[PDB]
Amino acid sequence: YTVGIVQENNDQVWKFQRYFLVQEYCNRLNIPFPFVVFAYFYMVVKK
Amino acid sequence: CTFSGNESKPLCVELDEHNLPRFPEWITIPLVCIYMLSTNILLVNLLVAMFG
Ligand SMILES: CC(C)CCC[C@@H](C)[C@H]1CC[C@H]2[C@@H]3CC=C4C[C@@H](OC(=O)CCC(=O)O)CC[C@]4(C)[C@H]3CC[C@]12C
Ligand SMILES: FC(F)(F)c1ccccc1-c1cc(C(F)(F)F)c2[nH]c(C3=NOC4(CCCCC4)C3)nc2c1
């Protein structure tokens, strides 16, 4: 019953969460993680 | 159990200074309880609902 009821309002919430995740990833260094640490060094040199 | 891997048996559990098992039941038993509850019951019923 719950699955039948809450289906229509599920994709909308997922799209909202998708916006959140996509903006989190875009508002990021966009560098592969195993080397991203270098950025944290380099950037902290400038900041 | 086998202390050495010579035999085709599971490795024996670690033992303490005294020759008694070293793991705590109060951690393992709740773990298995939760796992069985989640797998046997909840997940299968959810699958039934989605199939319906
Ligand atoms: C919330 C849901 C998903 C879990 C409920 C299942 C219960 C049956 C579990 C939860 C807590 C568990 C208990 C936590 C601690 C212990 C002590 C344990 O006794 C010992 O082995 C002590 C060892 C020692 O004294 O050295 C026996 C199981 C028991 C009652 C566990 C058995 C099963 C319990 C009651
Ligand atoms: F159908 C289902 F999914 F069961 C479920 C249906 C309805 C409501 C909740 C759940 C659910 C969801 C999750 C989550 F999505 F959050 F993961 C669960 N996770 C766990 C466990 N976590 O770790 C365990 C495995 C690893 C060892 C420790 C125990 C089991 N039980 C869940 C039940």
Side-chain angles (χ1 to χ4, degrees), chain A residues 21-40 42-44:
Chain A
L21 305 160
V22 169
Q23 278 299 305
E24 150 172 333
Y25 251 98
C26 291
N27 313 138
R28 243 276 300 279
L29 290 304
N30 304 9
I31 297 293
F33 217 88
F35 321 94
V36 76
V37 69
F38 283 27
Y40 301 148
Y42 154 54
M43 209 54 40
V44 73

Side-chain angles (χ1 to χ4, degrees), chain B residues 16-35:
Chain B
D16 76 73
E17 311 308 338
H18 328 96
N19 292 25
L20 277 324
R22 172 173 256 161
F23 64 91
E25 273 166 348
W26 56 275
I27 287 167
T28 61
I29 280 179
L31 204 74
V32 175
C33 295
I34 301 167
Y35 174 71

